[PDB]
Structures are given as structure tokens and as C-alpha cells.
Amino acid sequence: MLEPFQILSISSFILSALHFIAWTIGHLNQIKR
Amino acid sequence: MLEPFQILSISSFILSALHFIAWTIGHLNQIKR
Amino acid sequence: MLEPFQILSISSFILSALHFIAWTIGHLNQIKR
Amino acid sequence: MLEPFQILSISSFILSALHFIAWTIGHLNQIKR
Numbered sequence: 331m332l333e334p335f336q337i338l339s340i341s342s343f344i345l346s347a348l349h350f351i352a353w354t355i356g357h358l359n360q361i362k363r
Numbered sequence: 364m365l366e367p368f369q370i371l372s373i374s375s376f377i378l379s380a381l382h383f384i385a386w387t388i389g390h391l392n393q394i395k396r
Numbered sequence: 397m398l399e400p401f402q403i404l405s406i407s408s409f410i411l412s413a414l415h416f417i418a419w420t421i422g423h424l425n426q427i428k429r
Numbered sequence: 430m431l432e433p434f435q436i437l438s439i440s441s442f443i444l445s446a447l448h449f450i451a452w453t454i455g456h457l458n459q460i461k462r
Contacts, residue, residue, distance in 0.1 A: 338438055339371055345445055346378060352452060356459060357385065372404060379408050382415070390418060393425070405437060412444055419451065426458050 397403050 335438070338442060339368065342441070342445055343371060345449055346374065349448065349452070350378065352456070353382075353385065356456070357389065359459070360389070372401065375408065376400075376404060379404075379411055383411060386415065386418065390422060393422060405434070409437065409440075412441065416444065416447075419447075423451070423455060426455070 397406065
């Protein structure tokens, strides 16, 4: 744990914020053009 | 009921549902427009 | 199906698969033309 | 290493990269048409 686990929880957190913004842009972009 | 980690489980709950409804809307629209 | 903890891992798990499939079909539709 | 929930965290890891890598590829479809 910690080396192979804590690195998963945090890694995923970085992606969560990444997809969160990539979603508002690609989603909002659809209804905008 | 931790704090730095409990915010990950809850944060994921808000995103999990947002994606569930967002997927049903953008996916359904994909098979129509 | 335990408290908001195990019931969350399962809920999300069911979504992980749903998104995986919808991705192979919705993505393939893109490379259809 | 755990065992029951173990394989669960792993599966999620595969999707974490599958989404980030797929996003970089499918995103181009948006800026291409």
C-alpha cells in the first residue's frame, strides 16, 4: 500500500479535474459552435 | 469520515452521476442528430 | 451494498463497464463514414 | 496486497489510462470533422 495504492487515488484525482474541464469544454462546445 | 480522502469518494459521487446523465443525453442525441 | 463506501465502489463499477461498452460502439460510429 | 477489492482498484487503473489516452485520440475528431 502507499507505493502502489496511494499513487492510484491521487493519480485518479489529477485525471478527475482534467476530464472535468475537458467535459465542460467539449460538452459546452457542442451547444455553441 | 476522514477529510483529504473522504473528499475523493464524495467528489467522485458528484462526477459519477454527472457523467451518467451527461452520457444518457449526449449519447442519446448522438443517435438522432 | 454496505454504507456510502461499498455501495459507491459497486455503483461506480457498474458505470465503468457501461462507459467501456458505450465507448466501443459510440467510438466505432465515428470511423463509420 | 489485498485480494477481493484488489482487482477492483486495478480495473479502474486500466480505464484511467484508457480514458486519458482515448481522450487525446477522440478529441482530435472534434477539431477535424
